[PDB]
Amino acid sequence: TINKLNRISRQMLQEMGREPLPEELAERMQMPEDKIRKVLKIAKEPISMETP
Amino acid sequence: YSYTEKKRIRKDFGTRPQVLDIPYLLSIQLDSFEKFIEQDPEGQYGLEAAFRSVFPIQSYNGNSELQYVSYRLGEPVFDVKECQIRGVTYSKPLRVKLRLVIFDKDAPAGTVKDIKEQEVYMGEIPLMTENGTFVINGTERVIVSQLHRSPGVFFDSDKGKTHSSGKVLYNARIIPYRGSWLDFEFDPKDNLYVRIDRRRKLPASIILRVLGKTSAEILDIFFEKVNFEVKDQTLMMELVPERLRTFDIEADGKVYVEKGHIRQLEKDGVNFIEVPVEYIVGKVSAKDYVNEATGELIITANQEISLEALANLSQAGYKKLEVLFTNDLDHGPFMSETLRVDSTTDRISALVEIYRMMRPGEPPTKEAAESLFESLFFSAERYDLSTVGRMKFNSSIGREDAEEQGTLDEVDIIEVMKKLISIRNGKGEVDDIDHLGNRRIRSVGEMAENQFRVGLVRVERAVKERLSLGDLDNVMPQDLINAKPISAAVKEFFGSSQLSQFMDQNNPLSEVTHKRRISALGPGGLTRERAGFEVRDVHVTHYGRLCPIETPEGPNIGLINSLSAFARCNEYGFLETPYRRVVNGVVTDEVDYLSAIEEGQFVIAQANAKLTEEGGFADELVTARQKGESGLHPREHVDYMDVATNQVVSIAASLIPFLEHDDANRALMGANMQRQAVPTLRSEKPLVGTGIERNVAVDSGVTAVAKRGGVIQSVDASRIVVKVNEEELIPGEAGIDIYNLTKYTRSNQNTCINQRPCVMPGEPVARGDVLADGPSTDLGELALGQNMRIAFMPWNGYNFEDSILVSERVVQDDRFTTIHIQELSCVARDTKLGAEEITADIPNVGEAALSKLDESGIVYIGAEVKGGDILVGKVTPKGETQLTPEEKLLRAIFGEKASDVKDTSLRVPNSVAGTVIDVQVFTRDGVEKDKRALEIEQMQLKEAKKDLTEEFQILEGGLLARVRSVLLAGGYTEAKLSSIERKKWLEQTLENEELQNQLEQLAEQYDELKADFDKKFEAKRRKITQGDDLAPGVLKIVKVYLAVKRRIQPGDKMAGRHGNKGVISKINPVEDMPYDENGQPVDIVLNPLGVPSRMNIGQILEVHLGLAAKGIGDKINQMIKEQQELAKLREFLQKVYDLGDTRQRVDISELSDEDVRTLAHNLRAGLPVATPVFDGAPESSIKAMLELADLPASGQLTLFDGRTGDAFERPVTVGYMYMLKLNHLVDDKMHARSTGSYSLVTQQPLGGKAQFGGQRFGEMEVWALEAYGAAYTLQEMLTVKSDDVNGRTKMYKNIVDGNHAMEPGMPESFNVLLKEIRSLGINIELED
């Protein structure tokens, strides 16, 4: 789901020229906005505790 | 004189005319970004260069490829102010046109089968603000230029500090802009070896075999040949006259000495010399010799010829023998010996060796070795010796051609080797690594170009991978490019780089110095621990290029420098400085910019050199410098002169009056601490100045400068409207210039940024005139501090060390009162339990704390708030919490229980008191807006509508005034026109075609005006009303701005411009302060003892000059007060401005009566005087000024003690000093903690005032406690104060119970350490 969201996001970014907002990606991906946001937040990689 | 200068003319004490005005201070940034961002047809700089270096790219098989056509930058989504408000980067879209061209497989390669044109989005490029700054994530940032080493070849030595003996080893080092590094060094055995990116040494011959060089070719390249022959059964030697200048010499007519001058006998000239056989025995061969009959090699190249070899070549029939030349002074056998120690015998044996030393522990193959050596130095993709690098290499090795090349070749390597051997032999010298001709300036444009090229390559790998697949019928160019890597690269550079620094915004001087700063650190630079004395030192080439005074005092000493006043960067990145040409003995005004290399040959005079009326030198022998050494040189031998006396010092050092009387150590401190000054409520000019303040104020951009001349139509504290002059109007323009002023905006250091109008409605202004003054600016002059009355005397120990005694009067009139604006944010997020809400229903809080809150829970604007007051009310959902049985009984008795939500609300920080001046609410799209949000929303629409209507009204007024002038070119009566109502003009009916056509044109123009105004309004409304892109999981953000008036108090740091800093010790009452015979008390009492030891004598001269200037100020004040005649006012002003033999000719006669009155009104509070650095006011001028002001010539007055009324036994130096309030306030430096937060792992108190942490008891504190013997105090600090959790809890309980005893335990850090040591498979334990 995250990978397909990224692919569609890159296609839309190339097509309109700006970052696609969650409603637009939800309309393109045929899923509700809440699911899109849930995918968006849980796609993070935890930071290190030794970052300068 | 300009109007702003005419209002207040500063007296100039300089004596030397200035030929070249100081250029724009921020050129180093603007020029670099213009190079980066503008389209250049030659394609050598910026985005075009990166695109042409990267495109076109080719599929590996070769079916199709992508080509670059052009690029453009789109329109920004937001402006600078909007980007700062929302917190986004100010940038422009990058739109690049590309052609996907597909060839034909069946047709011969190179046939165009199909083409596809399309525009592709390549990311956002951050833009440079007109003042040289960037807006990244709503923050002003400055990218610091870097001082690095230019690409090319450098020759160096170990200075005889490596081998046991002296034996100074010599090395040569080539470094490209991108690629591998190549080193050619010498060993203690005098054999030259090679390193490729700093690995194990190899013999040199390999690097030539790989180039296809046979041994004989190598000795031909690196040696000179001497020939021998068998002539008439005798040895014959090819004599060269220069070589000869221990045996018997032939040519019996001109026999030289025999086994016991040369030029005299070589004058005749002969060619036949006979030598003994031994002369060949100790000499090495040069050419491989083969015998036809034997078919074998009798002698090899680089083999020592023996007697047996002589016999073999005698019987073989060879008569001519060419051999090498070897000396001990001029020529050397280094190459021959290196060939002897070489183990490789052919090219392939060379590439296998290079492969083993490249990739150890890998099986070597021929194809891989060939590919590796081709890619190491001869491949354009991995090696790029840039244009600057190629020029440096060509100049070093004396090569004239191959200027476009960026890849190495055989000639390059052989020339580097030749120069290394020559430098060994004695001809040639090593390079000065710290020479400014060997160091280059790399600015923002170059770095952005490099990062953009990196992003292009990262995209390009994937593009090439995709094109090889082959299925390309339905593809488009925009389906091949992913803008995310390139965007990631550019934001990496602009947000995470070391050299992209947070802006310094205390004052205009801080901004200007930050923009003109050069760092040797950063990527591709130095490291603090790896920097030595030599790099930190002041080189002789820093003259006119880098300031010798301005540098940080600390670990970064000498590694961060400041640009000189007139310094510039050439097209190759090397610093250059201007000089005046001396032609035919006259010193011309023509200016030539010279770099470090060009400066050495010429001898350059000084600005202090005396000049005659004809323009030539007066002294027969003048003081000059040549090749970096100063001395005395004849007049006729002088080529150049310095353009100004402040050429060698930076702007901050140029702002220090009487700098020549201060030691460099204290000048460094003064320059550094002028940048820490905090703007005050009222900006006051420096009475004693240098004449530079206007340049800094104008070029900083903090002021409002007139773009065009005219008359000020309207003035208000937030808007200046100027009616442009007729001569300066674009055809078909409105004619109105509108300047909207910044009012109370937070700076990067929490300081007020405010613009105050300095104009009046109706007064004329011209281009470049200052309309409004920004922070720390007074009438277009930089105003960093205040003029204080200073007495140099000790006062009861309250000025002990560097302490400062300040009168209470200074506090009363708020001369050092500052405004600090602070941002406080409340973020309502989304949690697992639920969504946090911003409501006023805060549990366990009464209506006393809700008085300043509105219905939506946000504080009002204008509310006086103190520490602990609620600003934004937020409640967070909480889960079920277990209650202790005692608490359950307590709830059983009294049934109160309301704990559904917990109070997590934004509160004013402790010890902070101020007023709320702005509140901004950001709401996510899809979240309901609370009442306050719509209140601010409608307020913003009302403000925008009113201001747009105002600009429309003024522009229409100007345009209709121009139209009225056009009509008045013919002339009619406008009363008849005004008889008809303005809208009814559109209702007129016209039958004649001439009038009807004009009526239709007017109607169309009115419609177009309506349409354009509507489109502007719709754009602004859409920008305002749209939602905010917040962080994932964030629902709402509320930002509150607090304004705090900070007044002077003990603990605050006050300093002057001469490195004299101090901390206020006491706010003395006015009666206690010393006073003079007229009853005027002093303001600040300073300790004189600081002056003699620190050699800052410029402050005393400043004190005397300030006293004289203020005295002239009181004379003008009285002469105005008694309503005296204007003629004597003019006479006094002319007498004042004619004092000294200065370069300033101010004619008061040409000033109007109103101008004279305004000038006198601006001079009541003191007469500003300019003392340029190294061209300052002498003591005689100061004494004359004091005599004019009816003051003692010694500058010392009789002071009386306020406490006792008794006169001090000795006269005291009293005057005026420009004092600054540094941003080191005791308000921000107090901290105290009893018990607070603790670390997660170590269970120790946090660190810092922000975290409410505790001070660190380090190793040396423990050492001091051990030396004292305080075992129990040390145990207290170690256990019950830091990490003994149970111990510290019981200690707090015991203190509350009044017991004052501790039960120490084991520190948690020791248990953690035991666990770590156990985790390493090591059993560490404790025994009883």
UniProtKB/Swiss-Prot annotation, chain B:
Catalysed reaction equations from the record: RNA(n) + a ribonucleoside 5'-triphosphate = RNA(n+1) + diphosphate
Gene Ontology molecular function: any one: DNA binding
Enzyme class: transferase
Family matches, as Gene3D superfamilies: 2.40.50.100, 2.40.50.150, 3.90.1100.10, DNA-directed RNA polymerase, beta subunit, external 1 domain, DNA-directed RNA polymerase, subunit 2, domain 6, RNA polymerase alpha subunit dimerisation domain
GO biological process: DNA-templated transcription
Gene Ontology annotations for the cellular component aspect, listed alphabetically: DNA-directed RNA polymerase complex
Keywords (A to Z) from UniProt: DNA-directed RNA polymerase, Nucleotidyltransferase, Transcription, Transferase
Domain of life, per lineage: Bacteria
InterPro entries in UniProt: DNA-dir_RNA_pol_bsu_ext_1_sf, DNA-dir_RNA_pol_bsu_external_1, DNA-dir_RNA_pol_su2, DNA-dir_RNAP_su2_dom, DNA-dir_RNAP_su2_hyb_sf, RNA_pol_bsu_bac, RNA_pol_bsu_CS, RNA_pol_bsu_protrusion
Signal peptide as annotated in the record: none
SUPFAM superfamilies found in the cross-reference section: beta and beta-prime subunits of DNA dependent RNA-polymerase (SSF64484)
Enzyme Commission identifier(s): 2.7.7.6
Function: DNA-dependent RNA polymerase catalyzes the transcription of DNA into RNA using the four ribonucleoside triphosphates as substrates.
Family: Belongs to the RNA polymerase beta chain family.
Subunit organization: The RNAP catalytic core consists of 2 alpha, 1 beta, 1 beta' and 1 omega subunit. When a sigma factor is associated with the core the holoenzyme is formed, which can initiate transcription.
PANTHER family on file: DNA-DIRECTED RNA POLYMERASE I SUBUNIT 2
Alphabetical list of NCBIfam families matching this protein: PRK00405.1 (NF001616), rpoB (TIGR02013)
Protein name as it appears in the record: DNA-directed RNA polymerase subunit beta
Species: Vibrio cholerae serotype O1 (strain ATCC 39541 / Classical Ogawa 395 / O395)
Taxonomic lineage: Bacteria, Pseudomonadati, Pseudomonadota, Gammaproteobacteria, Vibrionales
